[PDB]
Design a protein around this ligand. Structure first.
Ligand SMILES: NC(=O)c1ccc[n+]([C@@H]2O[C@H](COP(=O)([O-])OP(=O)(O)OC[C@H]3O[C@@H](n4cnc5c(N)ncnc54)[C@H](OP(=O)(O)O)[C@@H]3O)[C@@H](O)[C@H]2O)c1
Ligand SMILES: NC(=O)c1ccc[n+]([C@@H]2O[C@H](COP(=O)([O-])OP(=O)(O)OC[C@H]3O[C@@H](n4cnc5c(N)ncnc54)[C@H](OP(=O)(O)O)[C@@H]3O)[C@@H](O)[C@H]2O)c1
Ligand SMILES: Cc1nc(=O)c2cc(CN(C)c3ccc(C(=O)N[C@@H](CCC(=O)O)C(=O)O)s3)ccc2[nH]1
Ligand SMILES: Cc1nc(=O)c2cc(CN(C)c3ccc(C(=O)N[C@@H](CCC(=O)O)C(=O)O)s3)ccc2[nH]1
Ligand SMILES: Cc1nc(=O)c2cc(CN(C)c3ccc(C(=O)N[C@@H](CCC(=O)O)C(=O)O)s3)ccc2[nH]1
Ligand SMILES: Cc1nc(=O)c2cc(CN(C)c3ccc(C(=O)N[C@@H](CCC(=O)O)C(=O)O)s3)ccc2[nH]1
Ligand SMILES: O=c1ccn([C@H]2C[C@H](O)[C@@H](COP(=O)(O)O)O2)c(=O)[nH]1
Ligand SMILES: O=c1ccn([C@H]2C[C@H](O)[C@@H](COP(=O)(O)O)O2)c(=O)[nH]1
Ligand SMILES: [Cl-]
Ligand SMILES: [Cl-]
Lengths: 503, 501
């Protein structure tokens, strides 16, 4: 074979959403220093055992002539690595080995040039040859969630590869991105099992999210693992709605809001409705028509005549939802009359108070907005699912924890995660703080029985990098945010998954 | 003399007074779980070894008296080579017999194919194995109670350390766990795919660093202490003693198995129980606790604190509309600690206990103490703000949100307190016990507690105790301190920790 002995080459590459890798012999996007540190660390690692036996050993990096010309001259040859250039027009390049083709080079290297591992650093001529001929067994790929103008493209990865590793999602001010590993498709010590004190042979879980992904550092795996856990181990229970659900109690997810915006990528999520709902909460509204007028229908069934009449609200106007979330956030303790009454100056404006306290006393440990107003529960169309939330400041960063008493994992939860993430970013901005973490506590977490097929489909889908959130920096008071001031960039998702509401 | 006789592995079960036998029998009632542990531990063959020789077995060695203490119908122990040491019996059916240990170990390793050798007592054998350094690993079941006995496990030499601890388990009669003693003498992609520095300085503080298998629930708490000391931000707070702080944790405790009263220091249980009873009765009068020799709320009811925080017209120890008031009278107009609130406000505790009985699948089983309208009247707003029950498989669980968590002082009380409350509610509702899930928001260690918590996180946990409530108690208001009993509590010494106000 022409390529006898030239296999197990490892690719590093960074690829835009449209598959572009190069533009006018340069990188098509603004410099991502993080990504270069990742290439460098990836391509210069020698296992400790190998380095102790041959302390001067290095890895090899191979690239095409044009890619060599695309690297700043002061950085060449790439440090701590044997640089190999392929060319049929140039014979000699300072500090590098030069070969006329790949097969010659790999063979020469492995027989005559002691080294550790060989890496392929492009361009497309090389990537294409390496992929077209089965020579690569692993690909380290940086995924960028944006299209870029370009003239040089990464070839399609064959379906013989699968993603086995995904990093957390990162972002610059111009793109969101992550790091993945692709590999070709083709146990714990006994004391671990013994010292659980339980059965040493446990039936493994019936459902596992993305079972081919071994390194699972994308934050969305927290959610997918929860879906799989409830399906695997949840108890089927009746509930208020009349559609039964699989249920399990107590989870805690966290999302680093400085790095990405946690809008699920495993289905297309309706962001516009999330933003409109949040703005409605912030303005204190209990009038469901304010959402219908904006083509947001998420609260419609809970304001309808037949639901109201079914739950004792026979004197309530349609879509008068009672003293729910927004009324509690802005008017806790005020006497609810109807959705048309004037509550200016009535009750306690918790949102205003807490935002002011974050500014004036950030180390306070009572930065809480509470919607569980025990005195008003009976008056609400539905008691709040997201009950309570608390802020925290350290090192000039704002975090938020939220208690969700009841968590419809298929429908509500994805909205709830995005909602509090926006709110936290809004509060951080108006308080001049950076972003910490959103911590989401799930109490009764459940999957309605009519969503099982949808969730089964969803947990097999490989997450894309999360998008990023940009708020208009001119907005200085939380009441002034409008939907045009809240922008999610670089959202790449799998298709929407229809999921029917029980009620 | 013992050349080639090392690396013997001991299994044993030991009571708190070191007793292992009584009248040539086991001193405690039978723990079937413990025997499964023994059987599983001593019959295991690695899969690589088992496929190369499919008939291979481990060896179990015991003294003659231990062999005579095993029911005849179980002998020889199945799937193992049974070896008895004796100078008076020469033949035992189904077994090998030797006159001493060195002879037997040498004969076995030279002439009797086998996998691993286990030492199953008695004290004549354990004493020989330990005195002569022949053991490298000990699987030991720790029982938290003393038993009458006449046969004792020898002291384990300080050349051994505990390297594994199971969760705590319990029967009706004892709490126990499994531990491993041994002699004191990450693939790159995992580092790369974090996307952060590949060279990561180890945390400055690590709880019980010799323990590698860390299945005791108390490690959740100790790990948090170490995490806050290692990675918490030092910042000011209301008290004027700074604290190291980190945000957002979640612990869980299986209340069916044990009672999570910390064992790494002696915790003042009596005060936890009296405080809980005071909450349940809806009291806001701090004198009701002082009269019972419980002073945990005393500084917060003092004139000096009241007057500095603007409560100049409040009687001393009138704490205002705090926890108990909100539990039993949410929405009532607070006057003072001497007023009658009978039939005023919403009795959340009563309402939720009834709903657990009538509609356990309800998803609003919440008691909330964060009464925004009353916060300004409280001597201190509640630390444990909100709690929520859950029922599945005839078991009650509870989750509680703690806004502010003094890891040194308050948190150990808070864990035990909600554990008792959940057990109490389960009993009056006819349910079993699920889990207590404890959510920590601002979790912190005051600077003057750093020395104390450094001492504490190096202590090896004992098995947790167990809770027994008087079974005759039908209504939550009828529990008295005599009805709430913690059994088998073994702990390290108390650690003094001063309150920052
Ligand atoms: N984002 C990323 O990860 C990444 C990675 C690499 C490169 N890039 C970008 O990609 C662009 C450069 O890649 P490119 O594909 O244009 O060029 P390239 O593959 O780097 O260079 C092509 C040259 O290499 C020689 N060569 C090697 N193998 C060959 C083959 N099989 N057939 C023909 N010639 C071969 C030839 O030089 P002679 O003409 O001397 O024979 C050919 O002209 C730049 O814009 C660079 O910034 C991006
Ligand atoms: N909790 C636990 O894990 C555990 C484990 C084991 C046993 N036990 C309890 O321990 C008690 C029995 O232990 P024990 O200490 O009384 O007796 P033991 O050690 O089992 O047996 C003593 C007898 O075995 C022979 N023997 C032991 N070591 C020998 C050696 N090195 N060389 C020659 N012969 C040796 C001698 O028999 P001859 O007199 O025939 O020479 C000696 O009299 C029982 O109550 C049993 O239930 C408890
Ligand atoms: C994950 C990945 N990201 C990339 O941007 C990338 C680029 C190349 C193209 N090529 C092989 C390059 C190597 C180095 C370059 C560069 O412009 N470097 C900067 C920073 C130096 C460093 O830290 O590596 C410079 O020299 O100024 S461009 C090949 C594989 C890749 N792989
Ligand atoms: C059983 C139940 N589960 C819920 O999640 C729930 C949610 C709300 C209000 N809530 C806050 C909602 C969030 C998201 C929703 C929803 O229907 N999402 C659909 C379509 C979104 C759209 O097109 O606007 C989806 O995600 O597929 S509804 C009201 C009653 C409920 N009842
Ligand atoms: C951890 C441990 N616990 C023990 O109780 C124990 C006992 C011995 C003493 N000896 C080595 C024994 C082996 C088996 C026995 C026994 O009494 N078996 C009962 C119980 C059967 C079951 O529940 O599985 C029997 O055979 O009926 S007693 C040795 C090591 C130990 N190790
Ligand atoms: C800064 C601060 N931290 C607290 O944990 C705290 C707790 C209370 C009330 N609380 C709920 C208490 C729980 C436990 C306590 C305590 O002092 N424990 C000591 C002594 C116990 C005793 O012997 O009675 C200890 O555990 O060492 S105090 C009041 C103010 C506070 N202030
Ligand atoms: O923002 C929301 C609002 C509601 N729910 C879900 C949880 C339940 O499935 C249902 C409310 O029903 P109850 O728990 O109140 O029965 O809606 C959410 O997940 N998020
Ligand atoms: O049951 C309690 C009561 C209080 N605290 C702690 C947390 C804080 O350190 C302090 C209360 O002070 P603030 O958070 O309110 O400032 O007491 C507890 O840990 N548990
Ligand atoms: Cl922001
Ligand atoms: Cl007043």
């Amino acid at each position: 074979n022409s390529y006898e002995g030239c296999g197990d080459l490892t690719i590093f590459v960074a690829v835009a959403l449209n598959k572009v890798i190069g533009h006018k012999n340069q990188i098509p996007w603004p410099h991502i220093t993080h990504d270069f540190r990742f290439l460098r660390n990836g391509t210069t690692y020698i296992p400790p055992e190998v380095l102790s036996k041959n302390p001067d050993i290095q890895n090899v990096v191979i690239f095409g002539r044009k890619t060599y010309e695309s690297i700043p001259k002061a950085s060449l040859p790439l440090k701590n690595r044997i640089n190999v250039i392929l060319s049929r027009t140039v014979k000699e390049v300072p500090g590098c080995l030069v070969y006329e083709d790949l097969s010659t080079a790999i063979r020469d290297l492995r027989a005559n040039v002691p080294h550790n591992k060989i890496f392929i650093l492009g361009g497309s001529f090389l990537y294409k040859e390496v992929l077209d001929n089965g020579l690569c067994d692993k690909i380290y790929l940086t995924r960028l969630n944006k299209e870029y103008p370009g003239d040089t493209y990464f070839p399609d990865i064959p379906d013989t590869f699968e993603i086995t590793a995904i990093s957390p999602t990162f972002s610059t001010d111009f793109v969101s991105y992550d790091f993945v590993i692709y590999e070709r498709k083709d146990d714990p010590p006994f004391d671990q099992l013994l010292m659980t004190g339980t059965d040493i042979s446990v039936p493994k879980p019936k459902y596992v999210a993305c079972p081919g992904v071994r390194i699972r550092n994308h934050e969305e795996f927290q959610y997918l693992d929860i879906l799989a856990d409830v399906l695997s181990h949840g108890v089927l229970k009746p509930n208020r709605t009349g559609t039964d659900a699989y249920s399990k109690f107590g989870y805690q997810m966290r999302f680093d809001l400085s790095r990405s915006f946690p809008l699920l990528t495993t289905k297309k999520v309706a962001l516009r409705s999330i933003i409109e709902e949040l703005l409605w909460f912030i303005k204190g509204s209990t009038n469901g028509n304010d959402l219908l007028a904006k083509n947001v229908r998420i609260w419609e069934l809970n304001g309808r005549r037949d639901f109201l009449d079914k739950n004792g609200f026979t004197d309530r106007e349609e879509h008068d939802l009672g003293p729910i979330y927004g009324f509690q956030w802005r008017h806790f303790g005020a006497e609810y009359l109807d959705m048309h009454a004037d509550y200016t100056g009535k009750g306690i404006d918790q949102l205003a108070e807490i935002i002011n306290r974050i500014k004036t006393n950030p180390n306070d440990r009572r930065l809480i907005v509470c919607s569980w107003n025990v005195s008003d529960l009976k008056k609400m169309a539905l008691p709040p699912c997201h009950c309570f939330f608390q802020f925290y400041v350290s090192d000039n960063k704002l975090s938020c924890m939220m208690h969700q008493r009841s968590c419809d994992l298929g429908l509500g939860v994805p909205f709830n995660i995005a909602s509090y993430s926006i709110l936290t970013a809004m509060v951080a901005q108006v308080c001049g703080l950076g972003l910490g973490e959103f911590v989401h506590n799930l109490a009764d977490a459940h999957i309605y029985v009519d969503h099982v097929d949808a969730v089964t489909t969803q947990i097999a889908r490989i997450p894309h990098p999360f998008p990023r959130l940009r708020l208009n920096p001119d907005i200085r008071n939380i009441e002034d945010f409008t939907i045009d001031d809240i922008v999610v960039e670089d959202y790449v998702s799998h298709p929407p998954i229809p999921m029917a509401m029980s009620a």
